[PDB]
Amino acid sequence: MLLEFTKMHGLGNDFMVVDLISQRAYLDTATIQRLADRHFGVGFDQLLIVEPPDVPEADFKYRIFNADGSEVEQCGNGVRCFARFVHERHLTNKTNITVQTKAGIVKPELGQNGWVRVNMGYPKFLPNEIPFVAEEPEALYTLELANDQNISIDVVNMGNPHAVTIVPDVLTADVAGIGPQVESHKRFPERVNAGFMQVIDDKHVRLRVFERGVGETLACGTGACAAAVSGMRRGLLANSVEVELAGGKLQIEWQEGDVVWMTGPTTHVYDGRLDLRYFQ
Numbered sequence: 001m002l003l004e005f006t007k008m009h010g011l012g013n014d015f016m017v018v019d020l021i022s023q024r025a026y027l028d029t030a031t032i033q034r035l036a037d038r039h040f041g042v043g044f045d046q047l048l049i050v051e052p053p054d055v056p057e058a059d060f061k062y063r064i065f066n067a068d069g070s071e072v073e074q075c076g077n078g079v080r081c082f083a084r085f086v087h088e089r090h091l092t093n094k095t096n097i098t099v100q101t102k103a104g105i106v107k108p109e110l111g112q113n114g115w116v117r118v119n120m121g122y123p124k125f126l127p128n129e130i131p132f133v134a135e136e137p138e139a140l141y142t143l144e145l146a147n148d149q150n151i152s153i154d155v156v157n158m159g160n161p162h163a164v165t166i167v168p169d170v171l172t173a174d175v176a177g178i179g180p181q182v183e184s185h186k187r188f189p190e191r192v193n194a195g196f197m198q199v200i201d202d203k204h205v206r207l208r209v210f211e212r213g214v215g216e217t218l219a220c221g222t223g224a225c226a227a228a229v230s231g232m233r234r235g236l237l238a239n240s241v242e243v244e245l246a247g248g249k250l251q252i253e254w255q256e257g258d259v260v261w262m263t264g265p266t267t268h269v270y271d272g273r274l275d276l277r278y279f280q
């Protein structure tokens with residue numbers, strides 16, 4: 001009668017996580033919106049449901065929905081919460097899980113104290129792969145803003161589009177004024193996640209991200225990937241980098257020609273139970 005769930009977050013990107021292997025529930029778009037509501041519902045950035053696999057080689061399937069009920073994720077943190085969750089719920093004893101997702105097979109690696117290592121795929125850089133309006137691929141690009149202000153950006157696609165600019169001080173960066181101008185720039189026809197990176201040294205950076213359609217967020221994981229990859233391409237960063245997001249720290253590893261590896265934390269906040277009827 002009652003749906004059990006777990007509230008989790010990854011550096012403040014917060015999830016409602018539901019075992020739909022030992023449970024069954026009908027969750028349409030409106031029900032997800034009602035559950036997501038911070039005042040009337042559970043309150044979450046995304047909903048993650050664990051489901052029986054469709055293919056014999058997967059241990060699990062999952063799907064991730066936004067607060068408005070659409071099946072979308074911008075930052076790629078949910079995979080880490082998933083890997084922790086199936087362990088915490090005793091759904092498996094394996095720490096190298098094979099999971100079927102909307103992007104194919106993923107094999108997250110759960111380690112110590114809730115940290116999870118994730119294959120984030122290959123970065124893409126060509127303008128038409130971002131998408132970004134530019135005649136030729138370059139190392140950096142000048143982007144024109146309002147009132148004759150310009151910034152230098154690098155572009156990366158991690159499945160979603162990113163533009164990374166380097167600032168001397170992440171605390172004083174004009175994210176509120178510059179972010180919207182980048183995120184909706186005419187040169188980004190599908191909009192873009194705008195990252196503002198301060199380089200502390202070759203192994204440590206700080207990063208604020210103005211996310212597409214959202215604004216500044218605590219923990220854009222693909223944005224951390226894009227910033228670290230960009231700093232490596234510019235010859236500023238080593239091939240393993242701690243990125244301090246607004247929500248906390250995680251690690252990015254990359255070498256040109258290989259995939260990006262992200263190792264990030266997870267947090268178990270509380271276990272809950274609710275009567276789904278009051279939300280359907």
Ligand SMILES: [Cl-]
Pocket residue numbers: 142143144145187
């Ligand atoms: Cl421009």
